[PDB]
Scaffold this motif. Structure first.
Motif, PDB file in Angstrom:
ATOM      1  N   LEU B  75       0.734  -1.269  -0.070  1.00  0.00           N
ATOM      2  CA  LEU B  75       0.074   0.051  -0.106  1.00  0.00           C
ATOM      3  C   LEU B  75       0.807   1.108   0.094  1.00  0.00           C
ATOM      4  O   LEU B  75       0.364   2.479  -0.017  1.00  0.00           O
ATOM      5  CB  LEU B  75      -0.711  -0.008   1.101  1.00  0.00           C
ATOM      6  N   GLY B  76       2.415   1.224  -0.144  1.00  0.00           N
ATOM      7  CA  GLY B  76       3.078   2.125  -0.419  1.00  0.00           C
ATOM      8  C   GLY B  76       3.379   2.961   0.925  1.00  0.00           C
ATOM      9  O   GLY B  76       3.755   4.183   1.004  1.00  0.00           O
ATOM     10  N   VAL B  77       3.161   2.341   2.094  1.00  0.00           N
ATOM     11  CA  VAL B  77       3.379   2.650   3.569  1.00  0.00           C
ATOM     12  C   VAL B  77       4.962   2.377   3.655  1.00  0.00           C
ATOM     13  O   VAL B  77       5.277   1.191   3.763  1.00  0.00           O
ATOM     14  CB  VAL B  77       2.300   2.268   4.583  1.00  0.00           C
ATOM     15  N   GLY B  78       5.676   3.526   4.186  1.00  0.00           N
ATOM     16  CA  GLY B  78       6.993   3.224   4.424  1.00  0.00           C
ATOM     17  C   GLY B  78       7.620   4.341   5.263  1.00  0.00           C
ATOM     18  O   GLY B  78       6.981   5.097   6.125  1.00  0.00           O
ATOM     19  N   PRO B  79       8.873   4.564   5.467  1.00  0.00           N
ATOM     20  CA  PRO B  79       9.605   5.591   5.888  1.00  0.00           C
ATOM     21  C   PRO B  79       8.795   7.114   5.685  1.00  0.00           C
ATOM     22  O   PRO B  79       8.661   7.434   4.509  1.00  0.00           O
ATOM     23  CB  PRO B  79      11.031   5.639   5.224  1.00  0.00           C
ATOM     24  N   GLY B  80       8.698   7.632   6.977  1.00  0.00           N
ATOM     25  CA  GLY B  80       7.980   8.786   6.928  1.00  0.00           C
ATOM     26  C   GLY B  80       6.537   8.945   7.223  1.00  0.00           C
ATOM     27  O   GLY B  80       5.894   9.843   7.433  1.00  0.00           O
ATOM     28  N   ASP B  81       5.984   7.733   7.109  1.00  0.00           N
ATOM     29  CA  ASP B  81       4.549   7.733   7.441  1.00  0.00           C
ATOM     30  C   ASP B  81       4.277   6.919   8.679  1.00  0.00           C
ATOM     31  O   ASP B  81       4.912   6.431   9.285  1.00  0.00           O
ATOM     32  CB  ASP B  81       4.156   6.455   6.339  1.00  0.00           C
ATOM     33  N   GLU B  82       3.273   7.300   9.284  1.00  0.00           N
ATOM     34  CA  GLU B  82       2.523   6.966  10.506  1.00  0.00           C
ATOM     35  C   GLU B  82       1.424   5.937  10.289  1.00  0.00           C
ATOM     36  O   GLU B  82       0.645   6.151   9.354  1.00  0.00           O
ATOM     37  CB  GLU B  82       1.991   8.193  11.380  1.00  0.00           C
ATOM     38  N   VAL B  83       1.046   4.974  11.117  1.00  0.00           N
ATOM     39  CA  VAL B  83       0.223   4.054  11.098  1.00  0.00           C
ATOM     40  C   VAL B  83      -0.441   3.936  12.348  1.00  0.00           C
ATOM     41  O   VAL B  83       0.212   3.690  13.449  1.00  0.00           O
ATOM     42  CB  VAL B  83       0.783   2.515  10.693  1.00  0.00           C
ATOM     43  N   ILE B  84      -1.813   4.075  12.441  1.00  0.00           N
ATOM     44  CA  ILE B  84      -2.317   4.307  13.699  1.00  0.00           C
ATOM     45  C   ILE B  84      -2.949   2.812  14.061  1.00  0.00           C
ATOM     46  O   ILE B  84      -3.674   2.009  13.239  1.00  0.00           O
ATOM     47  CB  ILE B  84      -3.793   4.985  13.527  1.00  0.00           C
ATOM     48  N   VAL B  85      -2.631   2.448  15.150  1.00  0.00           N
ATOM     49  CA  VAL B  85      -3.000   1.027  15.616  1.00  0.00           C
ATOM     50  C   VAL B  85      -3.453   1.135  17.121  1.00  0.00           C
ATOM     51  O   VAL B  85      -3.371   2.346  17.861  1.00  0.00           O
ATOM     52  CB  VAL B  85      -1.793   0.079  15.585  1.00  0.00           C
ATOM     53  N   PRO B  86      -4.091   0.134  17.610  1.00  0.00           N
ATOM     54  CA  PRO B  86      -4.608   0.049  18.987  1.00  0.00           C
ATOM     55  C   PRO B  86      -3.678   0.039  20.013  1.00  0.00           C
ATOM     56  O   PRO B  86      -2.784  -0.688  20.066  1.00  0.00           O
ATOM     57  CB  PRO B  86      -5.930  -1.218  19.042  1.00  0.00           C
ATOM     58  N   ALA B  87      -3.913   0.716  21.427  1.00  0.00           N
ATOM     59  CA  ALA B  87      -3.024   0.612  22.555  1.00  0.00           C
ATOM     60  C   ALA B  87      -3.027  -0.693  23.285  1.00  0.00           C
ATOM     61  O   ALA B  87      -2.388  -1.004  23.888  1.00  0.00           O
ATOM     62  CB  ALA B  87      -3.471   1.913  23.276  1.00  0.00           C
ATOM     63  N   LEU B  88      -4.236  -1.328  23.203  1.00  0.00           N
ATOM     64  CA  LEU B  88      -4.470  -2.548  23.450  1.00  0.00           C
ATOM     65  C   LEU B  88      -4.550  -3.733  22.567  1.00  0.00           C
ATOM     66  O   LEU B  88      -5.315  -3.510  21.542  1.00  0.00           O
ATOM     67  CB  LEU B  88      -5.590  -2.673  24.402  1.00  0.00           C
ATOM     68  N   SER B  89      -3.545  -4.682  22.484  1.00  0.00           N
ATOM     69  CA  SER B  89      -3.208  -5.412  21.274  1.00  0.00           C
ATOM     70  C   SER B  89      -2.242  -6.241  21.509  1.00  0.00           C
ATOM     71  O   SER B  89      -1.484  -6.272  22.343  1.00  0.00           O
ATOM     72  CB  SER B  89      -3.049  -4.500  19.873  1.00  0.00           C
TER      73      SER B  89
END
Lengths: 421, 417
Positions: B75-89
Motif C-alpha cells: 500500500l506504499g506505506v514506509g519511511p516518513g509514514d505513521e500507522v494508527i494502531v490500538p493501544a491494547l493489542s
C-alpha cells in the motif's frame, strides 16, 4: 553414439532421470507425526543436536537462513548508516539480509575459480561506514576465512558466515559457521541437510549474541520451558520462529547425514574425475586446506578448447546446455546476473524513500568498481543442482559422465551450435 | 459447597481441566503425511480460504505479522509514514509498521469492545498518517463503519488485523475483506490453527495481492511453467508458508463451521450464566457484528463487592486466586498497553532511532481506557475453543457462581495485604 539433440539415443534414459530430494524415510514421517501429537521441544532438541554435532557453543533455530543473517546483524549492532560487504555472486538473500536490518549492502567481486568473495576486493570496498562482512561458502566451498577474518580484525568488523550451502564443510579442519562471530545455515528442502519446508539456524560461540537472536526471533520476548507468557518484550523483535515439525524432520535427517555425506563425497569425486579429463571443462574444486559440501556443482567452459576464438562464452554455454539436456543431464544456470544488477539494488528504493541507502547518502550511482569476475563466471558456466545430493545417485552420475564424454566426442557440432548462437 | 481456596471441592475436577487444541484428527495426520510425500498445498489453502470467506485474493505467508508488513509495503506505506494502531493489542500489530520502517501511533480503545476507539483515532491523525490497522481483538469486529469512514475521509489505507476473528462478520461481511487488505495469523492457539506458524493476506485488489506474492519470496515471480531464474523485481523477504502447515490448516478449515457451531453455543450458554452475576461484565459483539470468541475478557466492578475506592487490581487478583483454586484457568492477556513496551518507549528500533528518526518523533502517560481495562479484567484462553468444551464451561460457571455466593470472602482477600 549419435547426439540425442539430433534424434540419437540419450546417454541418460528417461526412466532413470528422477531423483527425490529430500529423501524421505518412514523415520522422517514418524518424527513429524510424533511432533504433531506431542503438542519435549523438537526445536530446542535440534538446537542441541546441531551444536553438538558441529561443535558450536550455541545454536538458535529460526524461520529461515535469511532471518538467521538479519538477526545476527542486529545482534552484532549493525543497522542504519552501516555498510555490510557481501559477494556479487550469491543467492539474493545474502544481499537482502543487510537491507532487512536497515543497513546498506556493498558488493565485492569473487574469485574466478572458488567463486567466493575475493578478500583483496573486500579490502578495496571498505569505507568508514563498513561494520561487517558476510563471506558466503558458495556452492559448498569454504571461503578464504583466514584473509576475511584478518581484514575484519584490522578494521574492527563483524564476520557472519553464510554457510547455507555448506553444511559439513570444513576450513583448516574447522566446521564452517564457527569461525566468524556467527554462522547462518538454511534448512530449505533443497539443501544438503534439508527440512520439509523452511528453516534456519544461527550458531555462535558468544552467549550474548545467541540470547539477542533468541529474543529477536520471538518479538523480543523471553519464552521459558513452563512459565506463563506475560508478553513482555525487551526490544525490537520479529516472528522468526522455526516450526517444531520441520525441526523434528531435520533431527531425523541428521541421523543419516554421515552416511549420505560419505556417498556424496565418493559419488561427486568419481563424477568430477571423469569430467576433469575433458578439455575446456573446469570442474569445481575445494580450495587448499578446506573441504567442499558439493551443494551445487558449477563448471566453467573455455571456448579455446573447441577452437572457438573470438566467439562469446555465452554461445558455448548455450550450445552445451542444449546438447547435455538432450542427453538427459539437467544442466542449469544458477544466478543470471551478479546481485548488483538486481532491480532492488539498482533502484535503491528499499522500504521507501531510498531507505536504507538514504541514511548513508548512497542513493546515486553505485560507488566503486564493476564486478568483472562475477560476470565472467556467469557468462561461461553451467551448474548441476539436486540430483548429485542423493546417496544412491552413483549410477545416475555415471550416466551423466557418459553424456559429457559423448558431447565432447562431437566437438565439431558443439562449435557449429555455438557458431550459430 | 465451600470454596476450594478454603478447603472445599474444586468446581472443576482435575480430570476435566485439560483441553486439546488444536484438535488433531486422522485426516489432519494424513494431510500432513500426504504433504511430505507430494495441486500445491499452499495454493490449495489460498483458494479454499478465499472461497470460504468470499475474498478476491488470498496470499499465504509465513506469519500474520508478515501479512501485515507486506500489506503495508504493498500500500506504499514506509519511511516518513505513521500507522494508527490500538493501544491494547498483541505486540505484532504495533511492530508490523516498524518492520516496514513506518511509525506506529497508538489510539486508545473502547471500554466495552476493547477495540480502537474511532473518537481517539480521529485525534491521532497527523499530516504523516498513511494507514490504520484496526484489530478485531479477542474475536470482536472493530467499528468498521467509523474506521473505514475515517480512512476514506482522510485518504488513508485500512489493513484489518483479523488474526483473532476468523469467521466473524461486520454487516454480514467476513472480516478481512472490508479494508484494503486483511491479515490472519495461523498458530496452534488460533481459532483456525496450523501445526506451527502461518499467515494469510487477503484483499480484493489484484495488484496488492501480486505485490505481497512477490514480497514473500525475495521479490521473485514463481511459476509451474518456467524454471526458477532468480530474477527479483523489488525488495522481498523469505516469508513463505510451509506446505505441511498449509495442508493441516486446509483439513481444519473443512471442519471449521462444525466447530464454530459448538463453540458459539457453548460460549453463549456460559456467558448467559455469568451475565447474571453483579459487577461482572461479559464480553459482547457490537451492533451488526458477530464475535469469534477467540479470547473471553471479563471486567469486574469493585463496587459490586463494596470495594469502592480500592484499586481494581486488588479485586482482579482476589478473583484470579479464588477462580484458579476452583480449577478455572483465569489469566491476563497483556499486562500493559503496547506504548509502555520497551521497544515503543525507547524508540531505538533498528538502531539510531529508525524509524522514528524519519518522522521527527525523536520526542506523558496516555491511553487511560486501555489501562483501566487491564486493571479490572481477567481472560479465558484456549479451553472454550474446543467443540466438546460445553460441560467444562458449565463447570466454570459453577465456579463463578460459587465465588459470587461468597462476596465477603472476596472483599476480605481484596482488602488484605
Amino acid at each position: 553414439s549419435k547426439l540425442a539433440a539430433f534424434g540419437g539415443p540419450p546417454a541418460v534414459p528417461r526412466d532413470r532421470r528422477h531423483v527425490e530430494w529430500p529423501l524421505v524415510e518412514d523415520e522422517d514421517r514418524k518424527a513429524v507425526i510424533d511432533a504433531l501429537d506431542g503438542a519435549e521441544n523438537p526445536v530446542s532438541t535440534l538446537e542441541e543436536q546441531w551444536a553438538g554435532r558441529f561443535g558450536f557453543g550455541h545454536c538458535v533455530a529460526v524461520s529461515t537462513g535469511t532471518a538467521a543473517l538479519s538477526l545476527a546483524l542486529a545482534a552484532l549492532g549493525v543497522g542504519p548508516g552501516d555498510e555490510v560487504i557481501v559477494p556479487a555472486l550469491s543467492f539474493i538473500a545474502t544481499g537482502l539480509a543487510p537491507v532487512h536490518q536497515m543497513a546498506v549492502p556493498v558488493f565485492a567481486d569473487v574469485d574466478p575459480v572458488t567463486f567466493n568473495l575475493d578478500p583483496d576486493d573486500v579490502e578495496r570496498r571498505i569505507t568508514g561506514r563498513t561494520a561487517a562482512i558476510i563471506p558466503v561458502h558458495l556452492h559448498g566451498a569454504p571461503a578464504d576465512m583466514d584473509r576475511i577474518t584478518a581484514i575484519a580484525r584490522r578494521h574492527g568488523l563483524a564476520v557472519i558466515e553464510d554457510a547455507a550451502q555448506a553444511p559439513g564443510a570444513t576450513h583448516r579442519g574447522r566446521p564452517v559457521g564457527g569461525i566468524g562471530d556467527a554462522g547462518a545455515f538454511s534448512l530449505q528442502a533443497t539443501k544438503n541437510i534439508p527440512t520439509c519446508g523452511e528453516g534456519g539456524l544461527l550458531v555462535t560461540g558468544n552467549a550474548e549474541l545467541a540470547e539477542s537472536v533468541r529474543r529477536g526471533r520471538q518479538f523480543g520476548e523471553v519464552i521459558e520451558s513452563g512459565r506463563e507468557r506475560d508478553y513482555v518484550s525487551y526490544g525490537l523483535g520479529w516472528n522468526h520462529k522455526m516450526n517444531a515439525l520441520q525441526a523434528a524432520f531435520t533431527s531425523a535427517q541428521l541421523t543419516r547425514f554421515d552416511d549420505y555425506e560419505s556417498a556424496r563425497q565418493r559419488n561427486v569425486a568419481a563424477f568430477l574425475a571423469r569430467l576433469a579429463e575433458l578439455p575446456g571443462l573446469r570442474v569445481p574444486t575445494a580450495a587448499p586446506d578446506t573441504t567442499h559440501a558439493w551443494h551445487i556443482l558449477r563448471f566453467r567452459f573455455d571456448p579455446a578448447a573447441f577452437g572457438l576464438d573470438g566467439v562469446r562464452p555465452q554461445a558455448l554455454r548455450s550450445a552445451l546446455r542444449r546438447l547435455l539436456r538432450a542427453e538427459g543431464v539437467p544442466m542449469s544456470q544458477y544466478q543470471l546476473m551478479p546481485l548488483p544488477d538486481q532491480k532492488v539494488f539498482v533502484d535503491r528504493v528499499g522500504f521507501g524513500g531510498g531507505y536504507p541507502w538514504t541514511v548513508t547518502g548512497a542513493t546515486g550511482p553505485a560507488a566503486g568498481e564493476d564486478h568483472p569476475v562475477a560476470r565472467a563466471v556467469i557468462a561461461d558456466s553451467l551448474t548441476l543442482q539436486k540430483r548429485h545430493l542423493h546417496p544412491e545417485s552413483g549410477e545416475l552420475l555415471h550416466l551423466y559422465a557418459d553424456a559429457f564424454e559423448k558431447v565432447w566426442a562431437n566437438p565439431d557440432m558443439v562449435a557449429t551450435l555455438a557458431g550459430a548462437a
